[PDB]
Design a protein around this ligand. Structure first.
Ligand SMILES: CCN(C(=O)CO)[C@H]1CN(/C(=N/C#N)Nc2cccc(OC(F)F)c2)N=C1c1ccc(Cl)cc1
Ligand SMILES: C[S@@+](CC[C@H](N)C(=O)[O-])C[C@H]1O[C@@H](n2cnc3c(N)ncnc32)[C@H](O)[C@@H]1O
Ligand SMILES: [Zn+2]
Ligand SMILES: [Zn+2]
Ligand SMILES: [Zn+2]
Length: 425
Protein backbone atom coordinates (compact mmCIF):
# COMPACT_ATOMS: atom_id res chain seq x y z
CA UNK A 1 0.00 0.00 0.00
CA UNK A 2 2.99 2.32 0.35
CA UNK A 3 3.54 1.93 -3.38
CA UNK A 4 0.01 3.25 -3.80
CA UNK A 5 -2.21 6.17 -3.00
CA UNK A 6 -5.84 6.96 -3.24
CA UNK A 7 -6.76 9.81 -5.46
CA UNK A 8 -9.75 11.62 -7.01
CA UNK A 9 -10.28 9.79 -10.25
CA UNK A 10 -12.28 11.98 -12.60
CA UNK A 11 -15.72 10.75 -13.58
CA UNK A 12 -15.05 7.81 -11.14
CA UNK A 13 -15.17 9.38 -7.69
CA UNK A 14 -12.16 7.97 -5.82
CA UNK A 15 -9.76 5.20 -6.74
CA UNK A 16 -6.26 3.81 -6.21
CA UNK A 17 -3.14 4.60 -8.32
CA UNK A 18 0.41 3.27 -8.19
CA UNK A 19 3.61 5.23 -7.36
CA UNK A 20 5.88 2.34 -8.47
CA UNK A 21 5.74 -0.15 -11.35
CA UNK A 22 4.16 -3.60 -10.87
CA UNK A 23 5.13 -6.59 -12.97
CA UNK A 24 2.72 -9.27 -13.93
CA UNK A 25 2.30 -11.53 -10.87
CA UNK A 26 3.30 -8.98 -8.23
CA UNK A 27 1.36 -8.56 -5.03
CA UNK A 28 0.04 -4.96 -4.78
CA UNK A 29 -1.52 -5.43 -1.31
CA UNK A 30 -3.65 -7.72 0.79
CA UNK A 31 -6.63 -6.83 3.03
CA UNK A 32 -8.04 -8.73 5.95
CA UNK A 33 -11.76 -9.00 5.89
CA UNK A 34 -13.46 -6.33 7.97
CA UNK A 35 -16.52 -8.60 8.18
CA UNK A 36 -17.24 -11.91 6.50
CA UNK A 37 -19.76 -14.72 6.56
CA UNK A 38 -19.52 -18.30 5.31
CA UNK A 39 -22.44 -19.16 3.01
CA UNK A 40 -25.14 -21.50 4.56
CA UNK A 41 -24.57 -24.28 1.95
CA UNK A 42 -20.96 -24.65 3.08
CA UNK A 43 -21.81 -25.24 6.73
CA UNK A 44 -20.22 -28.53 7.86
CA UNK A 45 -17.74 -28.26 4.96
CA UNK A 46 -15.53 -25.26 5.85
CA UNK A 47 -14.39 -23.59 9.12
CA UNK A 48 -16.69 -20.64 9.75
CA UNK A 49 -13.75 -18.62 11.08
CA UNK A 50 -11.03 -19.24 8.52
CA UNK A 51 -12.80 -20.91 5.57
CA UNK A 52 -10.47 -23.92 5.65
CA UNK A 53 -12.07 -27.06 4.37
CA UNK A 54 -11.77 -30.09 6.65
CA UNK A 55 -13.38 -33.44 7.11
CA UNK A 56 -14.06 -33.52 10.90
CA UNK A 57 -14.80 -30.01 12.04
CA UNK A 58 -15.53 -29.18 15.67
CA UNK A 59 -19.11 -28.14 16.17
CA UNK A 60 -20.46 -25.43 18.42
CA UNK A 61 -22.56 -26.59 21.46
CA UNK A 62 -25.63 -25.42 21.38
CA UNK A 63 -26.48 -24.25 17.86
CA UNK A 64 -24.79 -27.55 16.93
CA UNK A 65 -25.04 -25.59 13.69
CA UNK A 66 -21.54 -24.13 13.20
CA UNK A 67 -18.24 -25.80 12.59
CA UNK A 68 -14.63 -24.93 13.21
CA UNK A 69 -11.05 -26.20 12.73
CA UNK A 70 -10.43 -26.17 16.50
CA UNK A 71 -11.08 -24.29 19.73
CA UNK A 72 -9.14 -21.21 18.63
CA UNK A 73 -11.04 -20.81 15.34
CA UNK A 74 -14.30 -21.18 17.31
CA UNK A 75 -13.24 -18.74 20.01
CA UNK A 76 -12.20 -16.23 17.32
CA UNK A 77 -15.59 -16.31 15.59
CA UNK A 78 -17.75 -16.15 18.69
CA UNK A 79 -18.38 -12.45 18.75
CA UNK A 80 -19.97 -12.78 15.27
CA UNK A 81 -21.34 -16.25 15.64
CA UNK A 82 -23.23 -15.19 18.85
CA UNK A 83 -25.38 -12.99 16.59
CA UNK A 84 -26.91 -16.20 15.17
CA UNK A 85 -26.04 -18.98 17.74
CA UNK A 86 -28.96 -18.69 20.19
CA UNK A 87 -31.42 -17.27 17.56
CA UNK A 88 -30.89 -20.24 15.29
CA UNK A 89 -31.94 -22.56 18.14
CA UNK A 90 -35.17 -20.69 18.68
CA UNK A 91 -36.09 -20.22 15.01
CA UNK A 92 -34.92 -23.71 14.13
CA UNK A 93 -35.73 -24.48 10.53
CA UNK A 94 -37.67 -21.19 10.30
CA UNK A 95 -34.29 -19.39 10.53
CA UNK A 96 -33.61 -17.96 7.05
CA UNK A 97 -32.03 -14.45 6.61
CA UNK A 98 -30.38 -13.66 3.26
CA UNK A 99 -26.59 -13.54 3.04
CA UNK A 100 -26.80 -9.79 2.73
CA UNK A 101 -28.63 -9.58 6.01
CA UNK A 102 -26.17 -11.95 7.68
CA UNK A 103 -23.17 -9.82 6.56
CA UNK A 104 -24.75 -6.51 7.53
CA UNK A 105 -25.56 -7.76 10.98
CA UNK A 106 -21.87 -8.55 11.28
CA UNK A 107 -20.89 -5.08 10.12
CA UNK A 108 -23.11 -3.50 12.75
CA UNK A 109 -21.59 -5.75 15.40
CA UNK A 110 -18.06 -4.82 14.31
CA UNK A 111 -18.87 -1.10 14.38
CA UNK A 112 -19.91 -1.51 18.07
CA UNK A 113 -16.95 -3.73 19.16
CA UNK A 114 -14.43 -1.81 17.05
CA UNK A 115 -15.50 1.80 16.20
CA UNK A 116 -12.02 3.08 15.37
CA UNK A 117 -10.26 2.51 12.07
CA UNK A 118 -9.29 -1.15 11.47
CA UNK A 119 -6.27 -2.47 9.55
CA UNK A 120 -8.75 -3.29 6.79
CA UNK A 121 -9.38 0.42 6.14
CA UNK A 122 -6.00 1.95 5.59
CA UNK A 123 -7.13 4.07 2.65
CA UNK A 124 -10.92 3.75 2.79
CA UNK A 125 -13.21 3.29 5.81
CA UNK A 126 -16.59 1.48 5.70
CA UNK A 127 -18.20 4.77 6.92
CA UNK A 128 -16.74 6.41 3.76
CA UNK A 129 -18.33 3.88 1.38
CA UNK A 130 -20.10 5.19 -1.66
CA UNK A 131 -23.78 4.35 -1.35
CA UNK A 132 -25.34 6.07 -4.39
CA UNK A 133 -28.43 6.58 -2.18
CA UNK A 134 -29.39 9.58 -4.44
CA UNK A 135 -29.52 7.24 -7.50
CA UNK A 136 -31.57 4.39 -5.93
CA UNK A 137 -35.04 3.83 -7.34
CA UNK A 138 -38.14 2.92 -5.34
CA UNK A 139 -37.61 -0.70 -6.50
CA UNK A 140 -34.15 -0.87 -4.95
CA UNK A 141 -35.22 1.07 -1.89
CA UNK A 142 -37.98 -1.45 -1.39
CA UNK A 143 -35.72 -4.51 -1.40
CA UNK A 144 -33.41 -2.82 1.13
CA UNK A 145 -36.45 -2.02 3.34
CA UNK A 146 -37.19 -5.71 3.23
CA UNK A 147 -33.68 -6.68 4.29
CA UNK A 148 -34.02 -4.23 7.14
CA UNK A 149 -37.20 -5.97 8.34
CA UNK A 150 -35.50 -9.37 8.22
CA UNK A 151 -32.45 -7.97 10.08
CA UNK A 152 -34.66 -6.81 13.01
CA UNK A 153 -36.65 -10.02 12.86
CA UNK A 154 -33.73 -12.40 13.13
CA UNK A 155 -31.01 -10.37 14.88
CA UNK A 156 -32.36 -8.18 17.65
CA UNK A 157 -31.80 -10.91 20.35
CA UNK A 158 -28.17 -9.67 20.59
CA UNK A 159 -27.77 -6.51 18.46
CA UNK A 160 -29.41 -3.03 18.68
CA UNK A 161 -29.91 -0.89 15.51
CA UNK A 162 -29.54 2.66 14.32
CA UNK A 163 -32.43 4.51 12.75
CA UNK A 164 -33.99 3.51 9.47
CA UNK A 165 -32.23 6.15 7.41
CA UNK A 166 -28.79 5.05 8.68
CA UNK A 167 -29.48 1.48 7.67
CA UNK A 168 -30.72 2.18 4.22
CA UNK A 169 -27.34 3.86 3.73
CA UNK A 170 -25.42 0.87 5.11
CA UNK A 171 -27.35 -1.59 2.98
CA UNK A 172 -26.66 0.46 -0.22
CA UNK A 173 -22.99 0.80 0.78
CA UNK A 174 -22.91 -3.01 1.12
CA UNK A 175 -24.38 -3.46 -2.34
CA UNK A 176 -21.86 -0.94 -3.85
CA UNK A 177 -18.81 -2.31 -2.02
CA UNK A 178 -19.35 -5.90 -0.76
CA UNK A 179 -17.55 -8.91 -2.22
CA UNK A 180 -18.20 -12.61 -2.69
CA UNK A 181 -15.53 -15.04 -1.71
CA UNK A 182 -15.23 -17.94 -4.24
CA UNK A 183 -12.91 -21.02 -4.20
CA UNK A 184 -10.39 -22.30 -6.72
CA UNK A 185 -13.22 -23.58 -8.89
CA UNK A 186 -15.18 -20.35 -8.42
CA UNK A 187 -17.80 -22.01 -6.18
CA UNK A 188 -19.37 -19.54 -3.74
CA UNK A 189 -17.90 -19.78 -0.28
CA UNK A 190 -19.34 -16.63 1.25
CA UNK A 191 -19.48 -12.82 1.26
CA UNK A 192 -17.24 -10.20 2.82
CA UNK A 193 -16.25 -6.54 3.30
CA UNK A 194 -12.74 -5.57 2.06
CA UNK A 195 -12.75 -1.74 2.39
CA UNK A 196 -9.30 -0.98 0.92
CA UNK A 197 -9.93 -3.38 -1.92
CA UNK A 198 -13.23 -1.55 -2.61
CA UNK A 199 -11.33 1.64 -3.36
CA UNK A 200 -10.38 0.18 -6.70
CA UNK A 201 -12.41 1.16 -9.68
CA UNK A 202 -13.59 -1.16 -12.39
CA UNK A 203 -12.37 -1.99 -15.88
CA UNK A 204 -13.17 -4.61 -18.50
CA UNK A 205 -9.47 -5.01 -19.29
CA UNK A 206 -8.38 -4.94 -15.67
CA UNK A 207 -4.74 -4.74 -14.62
CA UNK A 208 -5.20 -6.66 -11.42
CA UNK A 209 -7.01 -9.64 -9.99
CA UNK A 210 -8.37 -10.13 -6.53
CA UNK A 211 -8.13 -13.56 -5.01
CA UNK A 212 -8.67 -14.97 -1.51
CA UNK A 213 -6.56 -16.85 1.01
CA UNK A 214 -9.16 -18.01 3.48
CA UNK A 215 -10.68 -14.63 4.39
CA UNK A 216 -7.63 -12.54 3.29
CA UNK A 217 -8.08 -10.66 0.05
CA UNK A 218 -4.99 -10.42 -2.11
CA UNK A 219 -4.51 -8.14 -5.14
CA UNK A 220 -2.07 -8.97 -7.96
CA UNK A 221 -1.07 -7.49 -11.30
CA UNK A 222 -2.17 -9.24 -14.45
CA UNK A 223 -0.74 -6.47 -16.63
CA UNK A 224 2.37 -4.39 -16.14
CA UNK A 225 1.28 -1.21 -14.25
CA UNK A 226 2.88 2.26 -14.71
CA UNK A 227 3.58 4.91 -12.15
CA UNK A 228 0.69 7.35 -12.58
CA UNK A 229 -1.69 4.52 -13.51
CA UNK A 230 -5.01 3.71 -11.93
CA UNK A 231 -5.36 0.23 -10.64
CA UNK A 232 -8.51 -1.29 -12.00
CA UNK A 233 -9.95 -4.68 -11.05
CA UNK A 234 -13.04 -6.14 -12.67
CA UNK A 235 -16.43 -6.04 -10.90
CA UNK A 236 -18.02 -8.53 -13.26
CA UNK A 237 -17.85 -11.56 -15.46
CA UNK A 238 -15.93 -10.43 -18.58
CA UNK A 239 -17.31 -13.11 -20.90
CA UNK A 240 -20.32 -11.12 -22.08
CA UNK A 241 -20.65 -8.50 -24.85
CA UNK A 242 -20.16 -4.78 -24.15
CA UNK A 243 -23.88 -4.08 -23.88
CA UNK A 244 -24.62 -6.91 -21.45
CA UNK A 245 -21.68 -5.84 -19.34
CA UNK A 246 -22.86 -2.29 -19.12
CA UNK A 247 -26.48 -3.13 -18.23
CA UNK A 248 -24.96 -4.91 -15.23
CA UNK A 249 -22.51 -2.14 -14.29
CA UNK A 250 -25.26 0.58 -14.42
CA UNK A 251 -27.68 -1.63 -12.55
CA UNK A 252 -25.35 -2.72 -9.74
CA UNK A 253 -22.79 0.14 -9.61
CA UNK A 254 -24.54 3.12 -11.24
CA UNK A 255 -21.73 3.88 -13.77
CA UNK A 256 -21.09 3.17 -17.52
CA UNK A 257 -17.63 1.76 -18.28
CA UNK A 258 -15.45 3.32 -20.85
CA UNK A 259 -12.37 1.13 -20.63
CA UNK A 260 -10.52 0.35 -23.80
CA UNK A 261 -12.54 -2.79 -24.30
CA UNK A 262 -15.85 -1.16 -23.60
CA UNK A 263 -14.84 1.68 -26.27
CA UNK A 264 -13.58 -0.42 -29.21
CA UNK A 265 -15.96 -3.36 -28.67
CA UNK A 266 -13.30 -5.35 -30.54
CA UNK A 267 -14.30 -8.64 -28.84
CA UNK A 268 -18.03 -8.30 -29.53
CA UNK A 269 -18.44 -10.04 -32.90
CA UNK A 270 -16.55 -13.05 -31.85
CA UNK A 271 -18.53 -13.26 -28.55
CA UNK A 272 -21.61 -13.04 -30.70
CA UNK A 273 -20.11 -15.44 -33.26
CA UNK A 274 -22.40 -16.04 -36.14
CA UNK A 275 -22.85 -19.30 -38.06
CA UNK A 276 -21.76 -19.53 -41.64
CA UNK A 277 -24.94 -20.97 -43.25
CA UNK A 278 -25.96 -20.98 -46.94
CA UNK A 279 -28.74 -18.51 -46.09
CA UNK A 280 -27.41 -16.38 -43.18
CA UNK A 281 -30.37 -15.07 -41.23
CA UNK A 282 -31.58 -11.45 -41.06
CA UNK A 283 -30.63 -9.22 -38.12
CA UNK A 284 -33.89 -9.48 -36.12
CA UNK A 285 -33.77 -13.18 -36.57
CA UNK A 286 -30.50 -12.68 -34.60
CA UNK A 287 -32.32 -10.31 -32.28
CA UNK A 288 -34.99 -12.97 -31.72
CA UNK A 289 -32.32 -15.53 -30.74
CA UNK A 290 -30.37 -12.96 -28.76
CA UNK A 291 -33.29 -11.39 -26.95
CA UNK A 292 -34.48 -14.99 -26.50
CA UNK A 293 -31.06 -15.98 -25.04
CA UNK A 294 -30.67 -12.95 -22.82
CA UNK A 295 -34.25 -13.74 -21.72
CA UNK A 296 -33.52 -17.43 -21.32
CA UNK A 297 -30.52 -16.40 -19.25
CA UNK A 298 -32.60 -14.33 -16.83
CA UNK A 299 -35.29 -16.99 -16.76
CA UNK A 300 -32.82 -19.83 -16.06
CA UNK A 301 -31.61 -17.82 -13.00
CA UNK A 302 -34.96 -18.46 -11.17
CA UNK A 303 -35.74 -22.12 -11.89
CA UNK A 304 -32.37 -22.77 -10.26
CA UNK A 305 -34.17 -22.03 -6.93
CA UNK A 306 -36.56 -24.99 -7.27
CA UNK A 307 -36.37 -27.34 -10.28
CA UNK A 308 -34.86 -30.81 -10.16
CA UNK A 309 -31.42 -31.62 -11.57
CA UNK A 310 -33.00 -33.90 -14.24
CA UNK A 311 -35.34 -30.94 -14.99
CA UNK A 312 -32.61 -28.22 -15.04
CA UNK A 313 -30.49 -29.98 -17.64
CA UNK A 314 -33.54 -30.76 -19.71
CA UNK A 315 -33.99 -27.00 -20.00
CA UNK A 316 -30.37 -26.25 -20.82
CA UNK A 317 -30.56 -28.63 -23.72
CA UNK A 318 -33.69 -27.33 -25.57
CA UNK A 319 -32.43 -23.76 -25.25
CA UNK A 320 -29.12 -24.81 -26.75
CA UNK A 321 -30.65 -26.54 -29.75
CA UNK A 322 -32.89 -23.59 -30.59
CA UNK A 323 -29.99 -21.16 -30.34
CA UNK A 324 -27.79 -23.45 -32.48
CA UNK A 325 -29.76 -22.60 -35.60
CA UNK A 326 -28.05 -19.14 -35.63
CA UNK A 327 -25.13 -19.20 -33.14
CA UNK A 328 -21.80 -21.00 -33.24
CA UNK A 329 -20.83 -23.25 -30.29
CA UNK A 330 -18.24 -20.51 -29.45
CA UNK A 331 -21.03 -17.92 -29.11
CA UNK A 332 -21.26 -16.88 -25.45
CA UNK A 333 -24.97 -17.39 -25.20
CA UNK A 334 -24.27 -21.04 -26.10
CA UNK A 335 -21.31 -20.97 -23.55
CA UNK A 336 -23.50 -19.61 -20.76
CA UNK A 337 -25.95 -22.48 -21.17
CA UNK A 338 -23.22 -25.08 -21.54
CA UNK A 339 -21.68 -23.75 -18.30
CA UNK A 340 -24.96 -23.90 -16.33
CA UNK A 341 -25.54 -27.47 -17.70
CA UNK A 342 -22.01 -28.44 -16.62
CA UNK A 343 -22.75 -27.19 -13.11
CA UNK A 344 -25.89 -29.30 -13.01
CA UNK A 345 -23.94 -32.27 -14.33
CA UNK A 346 -21.32 -31.69 -11.58
CA UNK A 347 -24.04 -31.45 -9.00
CA UNK A 348 -25.82 -34.65 -10.33
CA UNK A 349 -22.29 -36.18 -10.27
CA UNK A 350 -22.50 -36.91 -14.00
CA UNK A 351 -18.66 -36.61 -14.46
CA UNK A 352 -18.46 -37.89 -18.05
CA UNK A 353 -21.31 -35.52 -18.95
CA UNK A 354 -19.61 -32.69 -17.05
CA UNK A 355 -16.40 -33.31 -19.08
CA UNK A 356 -18.21 -33.22 -22.43
CA UNK A 357 -19.45 -29.68 -21.81
CA UNK A 358 -16.17 -28.51 -20.32
CA UNK A 359 -14.27 -29.66 -23.40
CA UNK A 360 -16.42 -27.44 -25.67
CA UNK A 361 -16.17 -24.48 -23.30
CA UNK A 362 -12.47 -24.18 -22.68
CA UNK A 363 -11.12 -23.04 -26.06
CA UNK A 364 -13.69 -20.31 -26.58
CA UNK A 365 -13.24 -19.17 -22.96
CA UNK A 366 -9.53 -18.74 -23.78
CA UNK A 367 -10.42 -16.50 -26.69
CA UNK A 368 -12.96 -14.29 -24.96
CA UNK A 369 -11.54 -13.76 -21.49
CA UNK A 370 -8.34 -11.87 -21.05
CA UNK A 371 -4.92 -13.44 -20.85
CA UNK A 372 -5.20 -14.08 -17.14
CA UNK A 373 -8.70 -14.94 -15.95
CA UNK A 374 -9.96 -16.85 -12.96
CA UNK A 375 -12.74 -18.11 -15.19
CA UNK A 376 -10.28 -19.68 -17.63
CA UNK A 377 -8.10 -21.04 -14.80
CA UNK A 378 -11.05 -22.64 -12.95
CA UNK A 379 -12.33 -24.22 -16.12
CA UNK A 380 -8.95 -25.80 -16.82
CA UNK A 381 -8.90 -26.90 -13.18
CA UNK A 382 -12.30 -28.53 -13.35
CA UNK A 383 -11.32 -30.29 -16.61
CA UNK A 384 -8.06 -31.51 -15.04
CA UNK A 385 -9.89 -32.91 -11.99
CA UNK A 386 -12.52 -34.54 -14.15
CA UNK A 387 -9.88 -36.12 -16.32
CA UNK A 388 -7.86 -37.38 -13.34
CA UNK A 389 -11.11 -38.85 -11.95
CA UNK A 390 -11.38 -40.81 -15.15
CA UNK A 391 -7.68 -41.66 -15.03
CA UNK A 392 -6.89 -39.71 -18.20
CA UNK A 393 -3.64 -39.04 -16.53
CA UNK A 394 -2.10 -37.26 -19.57
CA UNK A 395 -4.96 -34.93 -20.40
CA UNK A 396 -5.46 -34.36 -16.68
CA UNK A 397 -1.87 -33.26 -16.21
CA UNK A 398 -1.98 -31.00 -19.18
CA UNK A 399 -5.08 -29.21 -17.94
CA UNK A 400 -3.97 -28.90 -14.35
CA UNK A 401 -0.64 -27.43 -15.58
CA UNK A 402 -2.65 -24.89 -17.59
CA UNK A 403 -4.60 -23.84 -14.48
CA UNK A 404 -1.41 -23.51 -12.50
CA UNK A 405 0.20 -21.30 -15.10
CA UNK A 406 -2.59 -18.73 -14.68
CA UNK A 407 -3.00 -19.24 -10.93
CA UNK A 408 0.75 -18.65 -10.21
CA UNK A 409 0.08 -15.12 -11.55
CA UNK A 410 -3.37 -14.53 -9.98
CA UNK A 411 -3.01 -16.38 -6.69
CA UNK A 412 0.81 -16.23 -6.32
CA UNK A 413 3.30 -19.12 -6.62
CA UNK A 414 3.03 -20.01 -2.94
CA UNK A 415 -0.77 -20.09 -2.67
CA UNK A 416 -2.10 -23.17 -0.83
CA UNK A 417 -4.27 -23.94 -3.86
CA UNK A 418 -1.21 -24.32 -6.07
CA UNK A 419 0.43 -26.64 -3.63
CA UNK A 420 -2.71 -28.89 -3.68
CA UNK A 421 -2.97 -28.86 -7.47
CA UNK A 422 0.66 -29.74 -7.97
CA UNK A 423 0.13 -32.72 -5.57
CA UNK A 424 -2.80 -33.75 -7.82
CA UNK A 425 -0.35 -33.84 -10.81
C1 LIG B 1 -17.18 -11.07 -9.98
C2 LIG B 1 -16.29 -10.14 -9.15
N1 LIG B 1 -16.81 -9.83 -7.76
C3 LIG B 1 -16.49 -10.57 -6.68
O1 LIG B 1 -16.91 -10.26 -5.56
C4 LIG B 1 -15.53 -11.80 -6.86
O2 LIG B 1 -14.90 -12.26 -5.62
C5 LIG B 1 -17.91 -8.76 -7.67
C6 LIG B 1 -19.17 -9.47 -7.34
N2 LIG B 1 -19.65 -8.73 -6.17
C7 LIG B 1 -20.71 -9.10 -5.39
N3 LIG B 1 -21.55 -10.08 -5.80
C8 LIG B 1 -22.58 -10.56 -5.03
N4 LIG B 1 -23.46 -10.97 -4.38
N5 LIG B 1 -20.68 -8.46 -4.20
C9 LIG B 1 -21.70 -8.35 -3.32
C10 LIG B 1 -22.87 -7.63 -3.67
C11 LIG B 1 -23.95 -7.49 -2.76
C12 LIG B 1 -23.81 -8.00 -1.46
C13 LIG B 1 -22.65 -8.72 -1.12
O3 LIG B 1 -22.47 -9.28 0.13
C14 LIG B 1 -23.73 -9.68 0.83
F1 LIG B 1 -23.40 -10.66 1.72
F2 LIG B 1 -24.01 -8.58 1.45
C15 LIG B 1 -21.61 -8.89 -2.06
N6 LIG B 1 -18.84 -7.85 -5.77
C16 LIG B 1 -17.77 -7.74 -6.57
C17 LIG B 1 -16.75 -6.81 -6.48
C18 LIG B 1 -16.92 -5.77 -5.60
C19 LIG B 1 -15.97 -4.76 -5.43
C20 LIG B 1 -14.81 -4.82 -6.25
CL1 LIG B 1 -13.66 -3.60 -5.97
C21 LIG B 1 -14.61 -5.88 -7.12
C22 LIG B 1 -15.59 -6.84 -7.25
C1 LIG C 1 -16.16 0.04 -4.69
S1 LIG C 1 -16.41 1.63 -5.28
C2 LIG C 1 -14.92 2.11 -5.82
C3 LIG C 1 -14.48 3.35 -5.04
C4 LIG C 1 -15.30 4.51 -5.68
N1 LIG C 1 -14.44 5.22 -6.62
C5 LIG C 1 -15.79 5.47 -4.64
O1 LIG C 1 -16.07 6.64 -5.01
O2 LIG C 1 -15.88 5.07 -3.46
C6 LIG C 1 -17.52 1.26 -6.43
C7 LIG C 1 -17.90 2.65 -7.13
O3 LIG C 1 -16.75 3.44 -7.56
C8 LIG C 1 -16.98 4.11 -8.82
N2 LIG C 1 -16.20 3.57 -9.97
C9 LIG C 1 -15.33 2.50 -9.93
N3 LIG C 1 -14.78 2.26 -11.18
C10 LIG C 1 -15.31 3.20 -12.03
C11 LIG C 1 -15.17 3.59 -13.46
N4 LIG C 1 -14.35 2.89 -14.33
N5 LIG C 1 -15.91 4.66 -13.90
C12 LIG C 1 -16.72 5.40 -13.11
N6 LIG C 1 -16.87 5.12 -11.82
C13 LIG C 1 -16.23 4.06 -11.23
C14 LIG C 1 -18.49 4.04 -8.98
O4 LIG C 1 -19.02 5.31 -8.28
C15 LIG C 1 -18.78 2.65 -8.34
O5 LIG C 1 -20.23 2.33 -8.09
ZN1 LIG D 1 -10.20 -22.41 11.00
ZN1 LIG E 1 -23.00 -21.82 18.27
ZN1 LIG F 1 -14.97 -1.44 -19.71
Amino acid sequence: LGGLERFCSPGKGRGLRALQPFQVGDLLFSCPAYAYVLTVNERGNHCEYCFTRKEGLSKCGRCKQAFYCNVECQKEDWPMHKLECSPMVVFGENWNPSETVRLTARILAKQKIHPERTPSEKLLAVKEFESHLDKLDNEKKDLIQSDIAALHHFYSKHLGFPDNDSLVVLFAQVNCNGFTIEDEELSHLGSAIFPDVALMNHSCCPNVIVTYKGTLAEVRAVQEIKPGEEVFTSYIDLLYPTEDRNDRLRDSYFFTCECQECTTKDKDKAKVEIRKLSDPPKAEAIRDMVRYARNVIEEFRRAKHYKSPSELLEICELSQEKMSSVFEDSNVYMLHMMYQAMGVCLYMQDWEGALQYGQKIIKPYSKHYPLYSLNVASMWLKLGRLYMGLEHKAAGEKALKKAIAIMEVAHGKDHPYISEIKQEI
